[PDB]
Amino acid sequence: DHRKIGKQLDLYHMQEEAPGMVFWHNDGWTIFRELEVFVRSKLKEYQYQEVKGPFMMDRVLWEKTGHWDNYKDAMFTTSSENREYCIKPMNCPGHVQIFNQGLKSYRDLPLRMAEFGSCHRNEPSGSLHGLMRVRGFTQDDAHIFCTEEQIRDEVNGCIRLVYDMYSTFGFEKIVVKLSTRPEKRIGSDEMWDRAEADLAVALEENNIPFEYQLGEGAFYGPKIEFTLYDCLDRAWQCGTVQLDFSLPSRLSASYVGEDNERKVPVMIHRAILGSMERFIGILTEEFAGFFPTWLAPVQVVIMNITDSQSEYVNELTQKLSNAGIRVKADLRNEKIGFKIREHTLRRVPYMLVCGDKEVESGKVAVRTRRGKDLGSMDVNEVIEKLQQEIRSRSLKQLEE
Amino acid sequence: DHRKIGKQLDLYHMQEEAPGMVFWHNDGWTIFRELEVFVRSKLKEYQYQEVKGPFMMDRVLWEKTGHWDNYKDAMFTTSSENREYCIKPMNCPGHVQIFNQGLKSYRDLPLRMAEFGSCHRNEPSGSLHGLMRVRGFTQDDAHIFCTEEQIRDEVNGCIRLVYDMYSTFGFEKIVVKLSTRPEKRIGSDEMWDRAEADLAVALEENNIPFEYQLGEGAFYGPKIEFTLYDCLDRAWQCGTVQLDFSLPSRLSASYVGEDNERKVPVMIHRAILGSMERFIGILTEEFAGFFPTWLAPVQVVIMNITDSQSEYVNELTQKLSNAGIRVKADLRNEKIGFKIREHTLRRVPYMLVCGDKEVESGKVAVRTRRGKDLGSMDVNEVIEKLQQEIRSRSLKQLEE
Ligand SMILES: O=C(O)c1cc(S(=O)(=O)Nc2ccc(Cc3ccccc3)cc2)ccc1O
Ligand SMILES: O=C(O)c1cc(S(=O)(=O)Nc2ccc(Cc3ccccc3)cc2)ccc1O
């Protein structure tokens, strides 16, 4: 259960005065920020722009998209100078506004536009659940503006990216669903037929088995949903790929084609992790708090036995910190076995013990959060290997 | 004027349907993110935690702090399930909530807690100006919880950090103001006397000349204000250091002292850049769009003359990109002179031209956005020097 593990590792907390709002503590924010860096490296590789849209836009714009009519109950609203604003539940309209600055042509397409977009949705309080279902969350979101001829490759690209990213966390159980047209929707039947068919053909061409999930699509288009499970085998939508022939038209998006006529771009929506919040909840439960070294808030703790070795521990801490490792010293006058138990409960990958022998030899005794005693080793070697474990974003520690 | 420069370099835009809200385009967001990385490197060096508080909190909490009575008209409110929430105009209360999780002692102090905190303030629309005065902005904010004996060193730390960071951008107009007690305020007169005296002593010990700005302090404490000027020599509050003996008490913050009695922590508020938005407006005008290489959205553009060299350009682009440089290839079927002009107008620091001779020799012809022609040079040398210019965050290029 990620809520208990979350308290025990001091990752985050929640309070009545802000239901479904996460207060990220230093250590949870470290995880979050590490996820950002990882995502960003993929955005670079798969050629995405990164942008940032505003939190609020005029209610008039949300009426034009169909959100007001189809999504009103999940929207926070506010006002200023006799005008109403909606806090964004989604990043797409913001992205279209950016697309609409400056003349576009087919030469600019496909245009891939990513955002770590803070969304707010007024979910019923009784549906809230730790980090999985919150009122304020951050999507690793993007929108791809493309031609009709480009849809197949771009949808394939999103799917490639899901499996690429998910294999770093080592996911076996990726159940895939295709969520079809809901009762309340925009666009014609033909648009929905085409959009559902293309997502389905994409999955089939990639040899991905999936089930239909009738009526669980968005009002602006169907979804491929990559489903992950928690400790009670509850299904949680994480990765999501959507196809939309409606919003660009409504927000007057256009580009000049080769013909030289105005054409409306197709819009692909996708989020790989889903939200950072939910994904971290899934990870917390998947790993039972044993985060891979690259995600771990504290990667190394260095301990002395007596005051005799505190000097050496501080030098070592400095050294590791300079090598770019998240490290802490534990100099408390506590029995070493007491210290090991505490940092094991905090899921610290590596615990370095410094007795007189380690001092004398410039060595360090290594223990892991799994109770494994790896013996004395040369410091430079431990540093080099920690860096390799981090750089490769390895699932498994030294040995395993 | 940063608004015109902003349009012509595609950094950001603004629209009527979101007054005082910035839409960051890819290139503006790159600058913003580079400022984050820079700030973060300083947070590491000066030993800050980094956290993230929620956007919304219950109106009741804002009444407790005195914001509802003293700051109401600048606050956006929304509601859910018959409760009212405020969109945070500040990060301090959020930080205190985090501080209040888990028992604290003097051993934890000083506790430095930083956030890139998205603030929203309902400024009068007639006061809005480009990026300088907006409704939605991101403070490079922090709050330092400390004892009374620690105030001097911690305030000195904030001041050291301002001049440290500002010298990277090369500021030689740092006018400093000391903003004293406003008419509407919390805390006693003795608290205000002490707080004004300490800020004044701090400025004088650092040999900083300043003017008083009587009555322009915050309701929760006096401010040191570091003032930067725009192209029309208008004064803009950027860096800010505040001293607060009142908010922690109101939010029931406490720690166990050495004596072993409950004490209320002193709180120092500070923002070095101020907001990212304002600071970027200042920089845009200060540099007239010629950002230092480390800040530049695109650092290098590589161009071919004919199709003959496209292969070589792609290999080179790959190489530079892997060396960690923000690089683009320009393979359009355009005259080279046309291409160079375009990237010069966009203030790309370096333009690499590849003709048959560069191909044959594994060399590259380098020019700058200033029209400086550096001749043909070895590629590895160009890479090495670009990396040095970036790592050192130097103001001046290869050339000047
Ligand atoms: O275009 C969009 O607005 C968009 C919407 C979704 S979604 O709302 O269908 N998918 C989604 C699923 C889970 C999360 C995490 C989460 C956490 C709490 C509540 C709701 C969602 C976020 C998005 C996904 C990608 C998009 O570009
Ligand atoms: O923690 C702080 O530093 C802090 C600072 C302020 S401040 O408003 O005095 N500092 C400041 C200076 C410039 C900007 C940029 C800005 C401000 C208003 C509108 C637009 C941009 C932001 C904050 C208010 C509350 C705080 O907790």
Author numbering:
A (entry chain D), B (entry chain A): 2 to 401
Task: Quote the study that presented this structure, word for word.
Aminoacyl t-RNA synthetases (aaRS) are ligases that conjugate a t-RNA with the cognate amino acid to ensure protein biosynthesis in the ribosome. The enzymatic reaction consists of a two-step process, the first involving the formation of aminoacyladenosine, and the second featuring the transfer of the amino acid from this reactive intermediate to the cognate t-RNA. Threonyl t-RNA synthetase (ThrRS) is one of the enzymes involved in this pathway, and it has been validated as an anti-malarial drug target. Here, we present 9 structurally diverse low micromolar Plasmodium falciparum ThrRS inhibitors that were identified using high-throughput virtual screening (HTVS) and were verified in a FRET enzymatic assay.
Attempts were made to co-crystallise these inhibitors with PfThrRS to enable experimental structure-based drug design; however, no crystals suitable for X-ray analysis were obtained for the Plasmodium falciparum ThrRS isoform. Since crystallisation condition protocols for the E. coli ThrRS were available, and since the ThrRSs of the two organisms share 94.7% sequence identity in the binding site (within 3 Å from ThrAMS; 89.2% within 5 Å; see binding site sequence alignment in Fig 14A), attempts were made to co-crystallise the identified inhibitors with the EcThrRS, and use this information to guide compound optimisation. Crystallisation experiments resulted in the determination of the crystal structure of the EcThrRS-7q complex, which was resolved at 2.08 Å resolution. Structure analysis confirmed the docking predictions that the compound binds in a threonine-binding subsite and that the salicylic acid hydroxyl and carboxylic groups coordinate the zinc ion (the heavy atom RMSD value between the crystallised and docked pose is 2.54 Å). The binding mode of the zinc-coordinating phenol/carboxylic acid group was identical when comparing the experimental crystal structure and the docked model. However, there were minor differences in the conformation of the sulphonamide group. The sulphonamide group was slightly twisted with respect to the docked pose, and besides binding to Arg651, it simultaneously forms interactions also with Lys752, Gln766 and Gln 771. The discrepancy between the binding mode of the resolved and the docked sulphonamide group was the result of Lys752, Gln766 and Gln 771 side chain mobility, as the conformations showed by these residues were different from those in the complex with ThrAMS. Structure-activity relationship study was supported by the crystal structure of the complex of a salicylic acid analogue with a close homologue of the plasmodium target, E. coli ThrRS (EcThrRS). Despite the availability of the structural information on the ligand binding mode, targeted incorporation of hydrogen bond donors and acceptors to mimic the adenine of the substrate did not yield compounds with substantially improved potency.
